[PDB]
Coordinates of C-alpha atoms and ligand atoms in Angstrom, one line a residue:
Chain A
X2 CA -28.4 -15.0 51.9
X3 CA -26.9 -18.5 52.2
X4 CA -26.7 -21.7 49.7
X5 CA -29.9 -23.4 49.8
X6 CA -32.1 -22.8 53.5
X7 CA -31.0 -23.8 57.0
X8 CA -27.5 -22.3 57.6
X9 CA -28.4 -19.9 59.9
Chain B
X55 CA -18.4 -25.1 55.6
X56 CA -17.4 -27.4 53.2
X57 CA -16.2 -25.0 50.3
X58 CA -16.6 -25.6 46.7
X59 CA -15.9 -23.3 44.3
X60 CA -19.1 -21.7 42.6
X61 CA -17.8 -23.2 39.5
X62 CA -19.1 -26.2 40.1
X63 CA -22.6 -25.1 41.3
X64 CA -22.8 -22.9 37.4
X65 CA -21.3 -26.3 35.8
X66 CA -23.8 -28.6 37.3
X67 CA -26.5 -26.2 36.4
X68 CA -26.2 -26.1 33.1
X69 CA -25.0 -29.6 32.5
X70 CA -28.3 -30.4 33.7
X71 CA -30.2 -27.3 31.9
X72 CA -29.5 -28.9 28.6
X73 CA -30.2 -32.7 29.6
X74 CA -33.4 -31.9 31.0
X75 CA -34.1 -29.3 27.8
X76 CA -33.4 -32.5 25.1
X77 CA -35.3 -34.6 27.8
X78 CA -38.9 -32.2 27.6
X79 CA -38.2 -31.7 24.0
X80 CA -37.7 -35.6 22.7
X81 CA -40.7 -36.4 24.5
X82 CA -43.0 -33.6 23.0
X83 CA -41.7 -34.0 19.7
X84 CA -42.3 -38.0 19.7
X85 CA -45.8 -39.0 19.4
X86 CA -45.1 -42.3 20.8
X87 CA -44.4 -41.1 23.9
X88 CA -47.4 -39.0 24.7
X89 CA -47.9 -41.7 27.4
X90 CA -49.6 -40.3 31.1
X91 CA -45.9 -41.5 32.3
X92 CA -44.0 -39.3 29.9
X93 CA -46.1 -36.7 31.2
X94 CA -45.3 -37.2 34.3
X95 CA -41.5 -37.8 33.7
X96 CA -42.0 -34.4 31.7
X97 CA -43.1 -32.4 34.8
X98 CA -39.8 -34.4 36.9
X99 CA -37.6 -32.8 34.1
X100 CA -39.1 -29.4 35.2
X101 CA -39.1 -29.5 38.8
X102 CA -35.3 -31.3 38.1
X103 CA -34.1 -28.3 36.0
X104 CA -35.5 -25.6 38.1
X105 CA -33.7 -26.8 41.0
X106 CA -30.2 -26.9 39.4
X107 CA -31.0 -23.5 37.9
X108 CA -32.0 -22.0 40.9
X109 CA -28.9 -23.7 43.3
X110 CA -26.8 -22.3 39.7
X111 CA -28.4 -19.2 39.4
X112 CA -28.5 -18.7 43.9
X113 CA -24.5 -18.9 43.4
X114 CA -23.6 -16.3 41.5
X115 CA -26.4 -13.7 43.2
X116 CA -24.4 -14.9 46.5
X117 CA -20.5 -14.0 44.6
X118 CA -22.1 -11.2 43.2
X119 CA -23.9 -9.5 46.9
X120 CA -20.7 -10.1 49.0
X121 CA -18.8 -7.8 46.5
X122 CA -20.7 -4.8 45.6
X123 CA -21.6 -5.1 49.3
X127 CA -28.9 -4.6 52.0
X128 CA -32.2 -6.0 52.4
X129 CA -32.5 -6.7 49.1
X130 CA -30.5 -10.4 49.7
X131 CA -33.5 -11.2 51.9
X132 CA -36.0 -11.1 49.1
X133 CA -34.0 -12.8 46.5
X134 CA -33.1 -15.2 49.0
X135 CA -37.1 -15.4 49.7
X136 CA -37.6 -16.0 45.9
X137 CA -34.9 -18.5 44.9
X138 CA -35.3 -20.7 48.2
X139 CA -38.8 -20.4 46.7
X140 CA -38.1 -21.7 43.6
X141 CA -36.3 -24.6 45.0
X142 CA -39.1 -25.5 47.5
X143 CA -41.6 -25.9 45.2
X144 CA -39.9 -27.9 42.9
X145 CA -39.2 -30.0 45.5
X146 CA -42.2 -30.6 46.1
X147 CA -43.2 -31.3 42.7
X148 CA -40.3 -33.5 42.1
X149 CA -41.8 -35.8 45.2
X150 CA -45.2 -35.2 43.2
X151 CA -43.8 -36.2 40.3
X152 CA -42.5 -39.7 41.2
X153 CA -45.6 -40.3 43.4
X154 CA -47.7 -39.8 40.0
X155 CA -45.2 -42.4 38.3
X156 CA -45.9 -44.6 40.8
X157 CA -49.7 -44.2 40.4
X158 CA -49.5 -44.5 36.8
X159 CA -47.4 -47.8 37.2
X160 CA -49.9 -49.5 40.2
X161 CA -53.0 -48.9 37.9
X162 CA -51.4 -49.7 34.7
X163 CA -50.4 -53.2 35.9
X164 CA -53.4 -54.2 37.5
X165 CA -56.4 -52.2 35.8
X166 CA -54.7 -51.0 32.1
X167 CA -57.9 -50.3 30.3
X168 CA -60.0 -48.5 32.7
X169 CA -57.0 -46.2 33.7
X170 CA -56.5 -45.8 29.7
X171 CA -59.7 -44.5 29.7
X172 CA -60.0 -42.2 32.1
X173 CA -56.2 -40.7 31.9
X174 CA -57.0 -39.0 28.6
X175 CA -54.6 -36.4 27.5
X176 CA -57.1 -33.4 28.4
X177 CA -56.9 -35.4 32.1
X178 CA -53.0 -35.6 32.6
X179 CA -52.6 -32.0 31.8
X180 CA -55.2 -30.7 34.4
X181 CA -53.4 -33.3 36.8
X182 CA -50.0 -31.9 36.3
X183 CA -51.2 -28.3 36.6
X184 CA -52.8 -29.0 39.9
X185 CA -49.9 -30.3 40.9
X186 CA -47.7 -27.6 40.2
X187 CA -50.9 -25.2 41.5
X188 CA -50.2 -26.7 45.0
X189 CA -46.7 -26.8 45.1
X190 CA -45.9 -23.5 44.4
X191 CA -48.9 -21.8 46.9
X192 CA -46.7 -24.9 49.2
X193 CA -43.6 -23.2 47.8
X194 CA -44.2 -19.7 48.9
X195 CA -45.5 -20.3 52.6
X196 CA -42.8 -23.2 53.4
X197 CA -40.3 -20.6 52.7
X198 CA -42.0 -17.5 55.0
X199 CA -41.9 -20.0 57.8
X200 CA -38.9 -22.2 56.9
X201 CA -38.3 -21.2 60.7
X202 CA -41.0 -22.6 62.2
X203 CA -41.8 -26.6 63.5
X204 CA -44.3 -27.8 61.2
X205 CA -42.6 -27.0 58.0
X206 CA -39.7 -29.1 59.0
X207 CA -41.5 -31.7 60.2
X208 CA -43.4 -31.7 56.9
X209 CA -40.7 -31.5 54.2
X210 CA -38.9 -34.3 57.1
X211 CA -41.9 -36.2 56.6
X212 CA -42.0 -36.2 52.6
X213 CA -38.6 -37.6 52.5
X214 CA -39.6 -40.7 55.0
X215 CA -42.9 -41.4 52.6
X216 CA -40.5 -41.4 49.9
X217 CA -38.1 -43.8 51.7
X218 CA -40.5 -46.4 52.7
X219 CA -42.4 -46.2 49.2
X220 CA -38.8 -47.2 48.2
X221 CA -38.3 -50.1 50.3
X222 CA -41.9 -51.4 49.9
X223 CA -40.9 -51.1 46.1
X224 CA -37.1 -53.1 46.5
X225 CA -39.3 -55.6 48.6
X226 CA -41.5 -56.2 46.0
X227 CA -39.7 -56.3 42.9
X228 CA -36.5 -57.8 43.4
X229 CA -36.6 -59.4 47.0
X230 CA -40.2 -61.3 46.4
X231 CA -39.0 -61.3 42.6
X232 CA -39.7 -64.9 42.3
X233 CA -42.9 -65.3 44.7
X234 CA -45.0 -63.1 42.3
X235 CA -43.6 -63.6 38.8
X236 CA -44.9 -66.0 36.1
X237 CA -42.2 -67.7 34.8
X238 CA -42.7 -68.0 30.5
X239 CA -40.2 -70.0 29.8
X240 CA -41.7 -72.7 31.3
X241 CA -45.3 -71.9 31.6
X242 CA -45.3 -72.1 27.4
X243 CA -47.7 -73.3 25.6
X244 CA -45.5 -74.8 23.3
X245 CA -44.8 -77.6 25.2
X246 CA -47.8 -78.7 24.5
X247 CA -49.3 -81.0 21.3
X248 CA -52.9 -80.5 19.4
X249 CA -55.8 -79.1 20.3
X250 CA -57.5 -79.1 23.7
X251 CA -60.4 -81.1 23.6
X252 CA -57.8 -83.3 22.0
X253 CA -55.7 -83.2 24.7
X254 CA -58.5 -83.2 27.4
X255 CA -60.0 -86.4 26.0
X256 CA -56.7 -88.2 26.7
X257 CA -56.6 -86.7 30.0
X258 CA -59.7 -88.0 30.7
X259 CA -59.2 -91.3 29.1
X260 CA -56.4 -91.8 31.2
X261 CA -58.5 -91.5 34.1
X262 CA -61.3 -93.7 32.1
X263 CA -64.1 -90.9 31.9
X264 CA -66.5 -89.4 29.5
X265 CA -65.7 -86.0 27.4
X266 CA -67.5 -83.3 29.6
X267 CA -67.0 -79.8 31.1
X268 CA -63.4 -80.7 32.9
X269 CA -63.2 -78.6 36.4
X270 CA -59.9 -79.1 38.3
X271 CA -58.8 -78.1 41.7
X272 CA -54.9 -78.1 43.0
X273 CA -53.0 -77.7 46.3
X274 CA -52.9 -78.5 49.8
X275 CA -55.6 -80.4 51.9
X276 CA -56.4 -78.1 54.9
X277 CA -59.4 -76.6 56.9
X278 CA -58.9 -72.9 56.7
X279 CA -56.4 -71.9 54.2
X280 CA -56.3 -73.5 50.7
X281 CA -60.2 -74.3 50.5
X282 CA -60.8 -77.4 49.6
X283 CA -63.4 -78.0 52.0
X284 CA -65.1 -74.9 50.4
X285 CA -64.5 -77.5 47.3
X286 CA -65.7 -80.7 48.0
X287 CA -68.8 -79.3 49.7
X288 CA -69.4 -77.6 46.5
X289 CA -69.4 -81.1 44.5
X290 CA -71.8 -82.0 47.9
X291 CA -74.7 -79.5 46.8
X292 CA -73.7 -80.2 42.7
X293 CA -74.3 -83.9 43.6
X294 CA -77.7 -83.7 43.8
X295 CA -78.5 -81.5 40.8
X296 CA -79.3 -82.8 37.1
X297 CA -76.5 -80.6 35.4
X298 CA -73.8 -82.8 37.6
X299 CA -73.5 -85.3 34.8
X300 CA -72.0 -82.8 32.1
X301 CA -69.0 -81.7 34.4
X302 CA -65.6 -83.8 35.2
X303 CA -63.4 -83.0 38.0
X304 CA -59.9 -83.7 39.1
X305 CA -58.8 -82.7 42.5
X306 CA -54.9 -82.7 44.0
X307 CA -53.2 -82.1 46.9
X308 CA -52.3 -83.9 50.2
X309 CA -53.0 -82.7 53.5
X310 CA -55.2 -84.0 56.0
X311 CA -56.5 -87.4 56.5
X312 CA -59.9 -85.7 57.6
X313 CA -60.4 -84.1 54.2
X314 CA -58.1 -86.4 52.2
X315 CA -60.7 -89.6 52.9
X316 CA -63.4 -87.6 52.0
X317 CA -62.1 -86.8 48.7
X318 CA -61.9 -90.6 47.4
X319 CA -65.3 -90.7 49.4
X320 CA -66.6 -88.7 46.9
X321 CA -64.4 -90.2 44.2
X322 CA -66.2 -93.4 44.9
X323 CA -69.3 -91.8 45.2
X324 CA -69.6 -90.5 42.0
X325 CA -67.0 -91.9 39.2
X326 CA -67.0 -88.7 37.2
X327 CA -64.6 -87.8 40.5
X328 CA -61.0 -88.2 40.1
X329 CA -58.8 -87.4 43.3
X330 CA -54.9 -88.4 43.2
X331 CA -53.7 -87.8 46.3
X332 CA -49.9 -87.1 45.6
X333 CA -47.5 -84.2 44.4
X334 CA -47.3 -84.4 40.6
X335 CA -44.1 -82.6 38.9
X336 CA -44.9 -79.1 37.3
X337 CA -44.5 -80.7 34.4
X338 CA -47.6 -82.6 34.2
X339 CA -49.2 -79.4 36.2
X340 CA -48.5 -77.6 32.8
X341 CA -50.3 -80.3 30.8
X342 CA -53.1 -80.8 32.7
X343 CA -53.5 -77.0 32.5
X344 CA -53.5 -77.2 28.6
X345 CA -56.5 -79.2 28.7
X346 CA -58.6 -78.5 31.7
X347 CA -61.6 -76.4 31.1
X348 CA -62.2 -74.4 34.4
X349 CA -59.1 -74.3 37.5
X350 CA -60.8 -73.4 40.9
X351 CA -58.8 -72.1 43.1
X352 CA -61.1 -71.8 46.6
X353 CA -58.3 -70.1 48.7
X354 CA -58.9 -68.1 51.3
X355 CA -55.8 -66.4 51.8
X356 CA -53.6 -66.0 48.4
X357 CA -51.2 -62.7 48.7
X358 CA -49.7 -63.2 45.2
X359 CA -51.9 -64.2 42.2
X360 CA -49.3 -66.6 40.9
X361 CA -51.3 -69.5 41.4
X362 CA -53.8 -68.0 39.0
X363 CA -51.2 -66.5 36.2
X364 CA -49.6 -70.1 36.1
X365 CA -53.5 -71.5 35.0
X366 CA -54.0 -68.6 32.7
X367 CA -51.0 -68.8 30.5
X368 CA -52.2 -72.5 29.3
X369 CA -55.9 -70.9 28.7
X370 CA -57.0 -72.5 31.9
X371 CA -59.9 -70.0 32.8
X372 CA -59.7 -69.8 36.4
X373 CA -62.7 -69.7 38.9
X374 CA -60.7 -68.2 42.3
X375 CA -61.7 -66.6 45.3
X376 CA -61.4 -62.4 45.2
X377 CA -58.7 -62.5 48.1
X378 CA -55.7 -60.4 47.7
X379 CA -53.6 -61.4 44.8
X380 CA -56.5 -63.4 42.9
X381 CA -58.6 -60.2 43.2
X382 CA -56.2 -57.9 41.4
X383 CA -55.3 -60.6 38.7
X384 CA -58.9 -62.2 37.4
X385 CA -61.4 -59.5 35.6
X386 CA -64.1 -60.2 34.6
X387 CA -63.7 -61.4 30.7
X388 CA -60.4 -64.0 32.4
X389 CA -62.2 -65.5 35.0
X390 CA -65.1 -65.6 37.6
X391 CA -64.7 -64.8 41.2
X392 CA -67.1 -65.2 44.2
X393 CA -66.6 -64.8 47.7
X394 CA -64.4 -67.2 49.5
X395 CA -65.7 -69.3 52.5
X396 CA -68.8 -70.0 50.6
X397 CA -69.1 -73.1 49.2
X398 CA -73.1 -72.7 47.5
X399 CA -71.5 -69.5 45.7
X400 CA -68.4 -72.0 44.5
X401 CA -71.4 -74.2 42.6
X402 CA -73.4 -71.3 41.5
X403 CA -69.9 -70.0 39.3
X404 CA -69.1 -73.9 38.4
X405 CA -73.1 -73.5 36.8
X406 CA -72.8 -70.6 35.5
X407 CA -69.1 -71.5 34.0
X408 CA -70.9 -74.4 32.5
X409 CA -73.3 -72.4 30.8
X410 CA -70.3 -70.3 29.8
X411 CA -68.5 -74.0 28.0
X412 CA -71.8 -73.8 26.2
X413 CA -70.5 -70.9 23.5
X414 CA -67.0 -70.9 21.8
X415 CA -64.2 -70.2 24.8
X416 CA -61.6 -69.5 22.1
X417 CA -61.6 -65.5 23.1
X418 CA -62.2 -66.4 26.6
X419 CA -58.8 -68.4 26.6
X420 CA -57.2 -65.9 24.5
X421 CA -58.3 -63.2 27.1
X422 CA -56.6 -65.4 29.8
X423 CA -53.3 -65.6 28.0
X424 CA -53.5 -62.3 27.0
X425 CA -53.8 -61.2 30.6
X426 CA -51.1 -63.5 32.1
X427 CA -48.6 -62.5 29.5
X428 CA -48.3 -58.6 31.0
X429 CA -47.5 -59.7 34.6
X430 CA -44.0 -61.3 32.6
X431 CA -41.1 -59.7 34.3
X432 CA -39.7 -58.8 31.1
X433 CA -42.7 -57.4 30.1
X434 CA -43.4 -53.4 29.5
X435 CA -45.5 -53.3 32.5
X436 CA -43.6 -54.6 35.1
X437 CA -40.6 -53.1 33.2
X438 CA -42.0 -49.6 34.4
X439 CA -42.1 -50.6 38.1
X440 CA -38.2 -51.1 38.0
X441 CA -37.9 -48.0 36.2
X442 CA -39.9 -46.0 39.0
X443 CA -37.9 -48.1 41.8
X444 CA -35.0 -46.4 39.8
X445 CA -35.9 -43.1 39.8
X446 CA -37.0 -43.2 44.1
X447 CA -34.0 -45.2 45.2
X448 CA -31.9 -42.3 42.9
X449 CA -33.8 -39.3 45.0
X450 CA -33.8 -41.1 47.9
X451 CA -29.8 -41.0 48.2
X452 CA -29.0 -38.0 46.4
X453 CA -31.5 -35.8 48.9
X454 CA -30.7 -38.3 52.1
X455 CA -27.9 -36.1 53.3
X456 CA -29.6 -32.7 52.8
X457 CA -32.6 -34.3 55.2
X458 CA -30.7 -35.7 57.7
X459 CA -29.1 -32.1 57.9
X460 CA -32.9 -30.9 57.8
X461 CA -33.2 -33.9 61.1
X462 CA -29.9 -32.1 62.3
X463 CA -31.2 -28.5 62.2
X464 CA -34.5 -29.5 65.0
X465 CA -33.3 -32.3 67.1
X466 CA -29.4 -32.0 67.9
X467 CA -28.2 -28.4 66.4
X468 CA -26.1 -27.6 69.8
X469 CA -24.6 -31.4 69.0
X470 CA -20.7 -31.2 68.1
X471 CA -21.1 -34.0 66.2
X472 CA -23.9 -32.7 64.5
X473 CA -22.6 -29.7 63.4
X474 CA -19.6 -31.4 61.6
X475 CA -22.4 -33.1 59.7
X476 CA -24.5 -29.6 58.9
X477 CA -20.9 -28.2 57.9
X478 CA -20.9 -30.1 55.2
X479 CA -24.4 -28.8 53.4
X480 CA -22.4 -27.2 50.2
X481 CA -21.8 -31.6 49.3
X482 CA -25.7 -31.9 49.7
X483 CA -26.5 -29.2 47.5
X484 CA -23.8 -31.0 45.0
X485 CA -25.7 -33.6 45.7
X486 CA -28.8 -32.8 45.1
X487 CA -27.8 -31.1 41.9
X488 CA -26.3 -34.3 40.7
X489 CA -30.4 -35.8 40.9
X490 CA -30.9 -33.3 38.1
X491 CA -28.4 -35.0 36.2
X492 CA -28.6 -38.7 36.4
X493 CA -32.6 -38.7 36.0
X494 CA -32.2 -37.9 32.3
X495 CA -29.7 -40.7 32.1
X496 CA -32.0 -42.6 33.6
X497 CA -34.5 -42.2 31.1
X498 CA -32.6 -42.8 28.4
X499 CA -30.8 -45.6 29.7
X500 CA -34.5 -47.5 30.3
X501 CA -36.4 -45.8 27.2
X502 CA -35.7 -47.5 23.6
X503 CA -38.2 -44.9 22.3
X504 CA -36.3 -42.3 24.1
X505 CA -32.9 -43.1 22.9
X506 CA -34.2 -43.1 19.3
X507 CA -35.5 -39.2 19.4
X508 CA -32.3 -38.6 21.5
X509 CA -30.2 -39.7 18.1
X510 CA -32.4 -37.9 16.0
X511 CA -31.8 -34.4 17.8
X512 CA -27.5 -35.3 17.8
X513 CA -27.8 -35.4 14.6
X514 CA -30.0 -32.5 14.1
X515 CA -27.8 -30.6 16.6
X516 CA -24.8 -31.8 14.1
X517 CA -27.1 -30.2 11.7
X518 CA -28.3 -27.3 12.7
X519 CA -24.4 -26.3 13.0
X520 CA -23.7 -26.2 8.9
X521 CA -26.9 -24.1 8.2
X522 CA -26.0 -21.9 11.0
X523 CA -22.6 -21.3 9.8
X524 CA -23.9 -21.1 6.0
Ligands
OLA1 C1 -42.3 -22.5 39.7 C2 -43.4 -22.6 38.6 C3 -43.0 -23.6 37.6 C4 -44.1 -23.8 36.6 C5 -44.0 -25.1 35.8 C6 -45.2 -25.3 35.0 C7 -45.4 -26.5 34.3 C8 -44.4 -27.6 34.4 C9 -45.0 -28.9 33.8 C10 -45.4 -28.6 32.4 C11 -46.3 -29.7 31.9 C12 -45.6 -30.7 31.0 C13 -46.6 -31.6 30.4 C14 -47.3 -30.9 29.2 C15 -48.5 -31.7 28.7 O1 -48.7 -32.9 29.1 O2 -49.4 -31.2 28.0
OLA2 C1 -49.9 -46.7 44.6 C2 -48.4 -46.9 44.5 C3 -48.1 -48.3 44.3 C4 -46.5 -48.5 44.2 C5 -46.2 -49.9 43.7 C6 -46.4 -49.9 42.2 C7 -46.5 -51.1 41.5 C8 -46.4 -52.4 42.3 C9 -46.4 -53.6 41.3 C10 -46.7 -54.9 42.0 C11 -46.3 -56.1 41.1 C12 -47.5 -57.0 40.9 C13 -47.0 -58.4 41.0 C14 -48.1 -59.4 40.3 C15 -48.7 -60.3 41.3 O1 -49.1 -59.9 42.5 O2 -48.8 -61.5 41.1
OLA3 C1 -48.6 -62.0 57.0 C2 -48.7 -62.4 55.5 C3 -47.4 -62.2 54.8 C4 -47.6 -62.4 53.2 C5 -46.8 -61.4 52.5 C6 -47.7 -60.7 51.4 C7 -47.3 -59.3 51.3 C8 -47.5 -58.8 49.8 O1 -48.3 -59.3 49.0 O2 -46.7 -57.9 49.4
OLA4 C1 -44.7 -50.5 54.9 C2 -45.4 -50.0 53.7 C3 -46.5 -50.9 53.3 C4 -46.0 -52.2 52.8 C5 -46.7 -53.1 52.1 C6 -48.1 -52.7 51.7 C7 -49.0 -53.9 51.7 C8 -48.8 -54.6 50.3 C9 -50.1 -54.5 49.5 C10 -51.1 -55.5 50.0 C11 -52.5 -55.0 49.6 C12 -52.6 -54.9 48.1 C13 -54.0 -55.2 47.6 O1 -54.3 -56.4 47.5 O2 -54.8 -54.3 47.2
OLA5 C1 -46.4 -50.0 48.9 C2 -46.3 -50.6 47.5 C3 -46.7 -52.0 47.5 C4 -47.2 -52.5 46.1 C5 -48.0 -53.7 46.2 C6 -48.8 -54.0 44.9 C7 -49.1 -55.5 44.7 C8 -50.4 -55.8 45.4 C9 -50.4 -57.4 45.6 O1 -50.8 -58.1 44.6 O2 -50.0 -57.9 46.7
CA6 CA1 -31.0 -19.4 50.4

């Protein structure tokens, strides 16, 4: 569950 | 990671919740702006809104998860990032529709009037939003994978290059393509135009006839003015030769340039001055000529055409590039270039054309030329749409250069102080939310008139609230 998508 | 408190994120949400809100309502409740680009700019609004909402609305799940402390985060992760994918893509949708509108409004305005009803625009911009979301849904299951990125990569570089194409255009060739009224006036002109076009050709010493005139440069495979004189060749030997006058200009080769005055000799209704006149008596001749061919066959901007058209010269021009898109059929007539017994056909059939009252043809011609202006409302919307991409270019750059990041150099160190700071580019992209309804308002007189109307309301519907 991060801010916006590709954090991870 | 760049930390910034979640705040901001809320703040930025809502700042642009109520923009975008006055922005859908002030066009719906404005009849005058029920426009296919107002629709359009209505469904950027939504796609705009939804995105600050969701980046607002993603924050304070986040704060709220890591504190009453799962699975659960996954599918609301799944659902928001869903949220913001499809809007995405609607909001590149959105500004490729714009830039529809504006290409086919320019160039063809009545037959895309036609055709863009206000039943058609609706189905559009539900298709659009159809797509998008089904897009939405299976970006986000495999935001993992290679093509995904590679797509929502490639979106972002169509984007880019439709912006420079549209810099390029508009303000770099600003003065290659645009008709200049301030000169090209017909005020500088005197009387009528058989008035001025007997002096014109009782300066040259010639009978009042059907007045076709050709200017520009003497060469053998780019202006056409071999396709020209070969034309006055075959019109020689016909009967209906007598009734027409023409005047050709331009220096360029000795080979073509002696057979001009061979055929000015020739033939005595033939006038060929072979030097440069100033624009100025360009402009006056155009004011009285009847028909101006332009042969060419190579002419990227219609310029050459707009320039004949503005002084009700009705121009007969080759359909190659930028005298296609100008000259319709009720300003002009076109044939194909290179052939010169389809250049006298159009000069006979423009001389059974001099046989009715040209009044409305002219007035079609000026009519036409005078929406190409650069302070016109049509090529007033193209700077608005260059705008509104060059705005979502920067404002999403960063986040796809993290996207570039994330596949082709994640191990970088260098890199990675870059992804680090993703929390700016989701400020960042917030902030597009927020500066397209300025935008709109900024280049919308309309706009800013039903933007006072609901400040005033909103000033009103304060007193009866408390009373
Ligand atoms: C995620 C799903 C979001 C759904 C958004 C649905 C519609 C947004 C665009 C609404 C159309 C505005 C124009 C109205 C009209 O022209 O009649
Ligand atoms: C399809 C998307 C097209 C994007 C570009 C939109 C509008 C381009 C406007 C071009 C201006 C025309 C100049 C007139 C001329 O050629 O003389
Ligand atoms: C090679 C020809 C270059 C001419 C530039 C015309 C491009 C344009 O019309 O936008
Ligand atoms: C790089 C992106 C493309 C750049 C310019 C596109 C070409 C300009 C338009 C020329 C053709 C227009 C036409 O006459 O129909
Ligand atoms: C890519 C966008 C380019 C837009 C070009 C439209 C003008 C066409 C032309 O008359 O050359
Ligand atoms: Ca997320």
């Amino acid at each position: 569950l991060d801010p916006x998508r590709w954090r991870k | 990671q760049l930390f910034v408190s979640p705040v901001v994120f809320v703040t930025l949400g809502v700042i642009s919740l109520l923009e975008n809100i006055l922005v859908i309502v002030a066009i719906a409740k404005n009849k005058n702006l029920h426009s296919p680009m107002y629709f359009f700019i209505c469904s950027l609004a939504v796609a705009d809104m939804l995105v600050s909402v969701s980046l607002g609305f993603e924050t304070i799940v986040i704060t709220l998860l890591n504190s009453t402390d799962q699975s659960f985060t996954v599918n609301i992760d799944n659902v928001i990032d869903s949220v913001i994918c499809a809007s995405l893509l609607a909001s590149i949708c959105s500004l490729l529709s714009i830039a529809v509108d504006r290409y086919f409004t320019i160039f063809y305005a009545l037959q895309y009037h036609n055709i863009m009803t206000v039943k058609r625009v609706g189905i559009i911009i539900s298709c659009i939003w159809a797509a998008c979301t089904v897009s939405g849904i299976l970006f986000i299951i495999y935001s993992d994978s290679s093509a995904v990125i590679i797509c929502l990569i490639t979106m972002f570089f169509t984007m880019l290059a439709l912006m420079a194409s549209l810099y390029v255009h508009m303000f770099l060739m600003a003065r290659l393509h645009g008709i200049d009224c301030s000169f090209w006036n017909e005020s500088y002109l005197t009387g009528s135009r058989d008035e001025r076009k007997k002096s014109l050709l009782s300066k040259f010493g010639m009978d009042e006839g059907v007045t076709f005139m050709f200017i520009g440069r003497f060469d053998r495979g780019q202006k056409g003015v071999d396709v020209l004189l070969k034309a006055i060749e075959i019109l020689s030997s016909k009967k209906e030769f007598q009734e027409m006058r023409f005047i050709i200009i331009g220096k360029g080769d000795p080979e073509l340039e002696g057979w001009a005055r061979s055929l000015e000799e020739k033939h005595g209704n033939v006038k060929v001055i072979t030097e440069m006149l100033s624009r100025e008596f360009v402009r006056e001749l155009y004011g009285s000529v009847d028909f101006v061919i332009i042969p060419s066959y190579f002419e990227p901007f219609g310029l050459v055409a707009l320039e004949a058209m503005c002084l009700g010269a009705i121009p007969i021009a080759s359909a190659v590039g930028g005298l296609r898109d100008i000259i319709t059929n009720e300003t002009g007539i076109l044939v194909k270039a290179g052939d010169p017994g389809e250049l006298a056909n159009a000069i006979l059939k423009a001389l059974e054309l001099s046989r009715s009252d040209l009044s409305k043809f002219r007035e079609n011609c000026k009519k036409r030329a005078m929406s190409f202006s650069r302070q016109g409302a049509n090529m007033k919307g193209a700077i608005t749409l260059t705008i509104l991409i060059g705005v979502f270019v920067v404002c999403w750059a960063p986040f796809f250069l993290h996207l570039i990041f994330y596949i082709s150099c994640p191990q970088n160190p260098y890199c990675v102080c870059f992804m680090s700071h993703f929390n700016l580019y989701l400020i960042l992209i917030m902030c597009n939310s927020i500066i397209n309804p300025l935008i709109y308002a900024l280049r919308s007189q309309e706009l800013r008139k039903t933007f006072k109307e609901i400040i005033c309301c909103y000033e009103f519907l304060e007193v009866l609230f408390q009373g």
